[PDB]
Amino acid sequence: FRPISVFREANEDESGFTCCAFSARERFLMLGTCTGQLKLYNVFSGQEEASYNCHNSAITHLEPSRDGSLLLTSATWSQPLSALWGMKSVFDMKHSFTEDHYVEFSKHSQDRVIGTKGDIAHIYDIQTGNKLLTLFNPDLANNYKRNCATFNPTDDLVLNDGVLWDVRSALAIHKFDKFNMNISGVFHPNGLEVIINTEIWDLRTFHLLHTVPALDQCRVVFNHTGTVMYGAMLQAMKSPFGSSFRTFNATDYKPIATIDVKRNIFDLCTDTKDCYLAVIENQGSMDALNMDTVCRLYEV
């Protein structure tokens, strides 16, 4: 992890970056801010190239579509809470998801959005904006406090609140047992495994394949080739994470590195070629009057 670049938000006594993701154009990082702006930055110069007010509360998450034409945002305390934006020619709002705290695109064919409202998953069509499906069963709920619903790589299974759902049938196929209060899980990019906090489960057998005690309380992000997994641990204003991230080999779950950047982490992401890790670090403590975050770019 050799540091390659650092920048603060332009035109701010205090820098308010809260989350990031690389755009479909190399060199250009998309960042959300604590005032609910989306911003486009040159990741090398730190030059702000564009700006849009998406929400009147902080941005917690953003996801650009692979084809460069669409963007998902989530905010703290807005109605609507999440939204879908168009970025062809003009920046505009396409749809809004009135109480979803988190959203993702479908993975194989990016024609759907999955949104999370507490313990409930909503799937929407991108064209119509219609809610196609509500996935929720109160008898199978884990009530994870950081529940985030997600599609698998082929868009035909969903993980919501520790329940594996078959999208076509809208049937719960398996409830994974609850071993922590917060982390709900992700799909491995290989389509065969699910990572739920410290537990790695096989999707064909439901056997326990690995225990990874360093993944405890980590939000997991994969690189684009799916060879490496990055974990930032929940913190025990207030960042959602602590000041350390961990890397693991995605094939054998062996630890590669533990990096303490001595600054609470708000988000991290890789470019599509997996050359870079961009990390949003706060220079201020949780007690500061105001956030003062930087974006740090490291070469892996």
Give the residue, chosen from 113, 148, 149, 250, that forms a contact with ligand VMZ under the rule CB under 6 A: 148
Is 146 a binding residue for ligand VMZ by CB under 6 A? The answer is yes
| Residue 110 interacting entry, from Mg ion, ligand VMZ, none, C-beta within 5 to 8 Å by type | none
Judged by beta carbon distances under 5 to 8 A according to partner kind, the member of Mg ion, ligand VMZ, none in contact with residue 5 is Mg ion
Decide: is 55 part of the binding site for ligand VMZ (CB under 6 A): no
d(CA 84, CA 217): 29
The helix, strand and coil proportions of the chain, stated in percent and rounded to the nearest 5, come to 0, 50, 50
DSSP string, 99-112: T-SEEEE-SSS--E
CB of 68 vs ligand VMZ, minimal distance in Å: 8
**105 half-sphere exposure, CB direction, 13 A CA radius:** 19
The residues that touch Mg ion, with contacts defined as CB under 5 A, are 5
Question: What are the C-alpha distances in Å from 116 to residues 133, 151, 272?
Answer: 12, 12, 25
Query: Which residue in the set 49, 99, 125, 216 belongs to the binding site for ligand VMZ (CB under 6 A)?
Result: 49
In whole angstroms, how close is the CB of 3 to Mg ion at the nearest point? 10
If binding is defined by CB under 6 A, does position 60 make contact with ligand VMZ?
yes
Q: Tally helices (H) and strands (E) across the chain.
A: 0, 28
From 56-64, 107-115, 189-197, 244-252, give the range in contact with ligand VMZ by CB under 6 A: 56-64
Taking the C-alpha atoms of residue 107 and residue 121, their distance in angstroms, rounded to an integer, is 16
Residue 260 near residue 243 (C-beta atoms within 8 A): yes
CB of 38 to ligand VMZ, least distance (A): 4
**Binding of residue 82 to ligand VMZ (CB under 6 A):** no
Q: Which does 220 bind (CB under 5 to 8 A by kind): ligand VMZ, Mg ion, none?
A: none
CB-based contacts of 267: which residues, under 8 Å, 6+ apart?
18, 19, 20, 279, 280
Binding positions for ligand VMZ, 20-39, rule CB under 6 A: 25, 28, 34, 38-39
User: Is 87 one of the binding residues for ligand VMZ (CB under 6 A)?
Assistant: yes
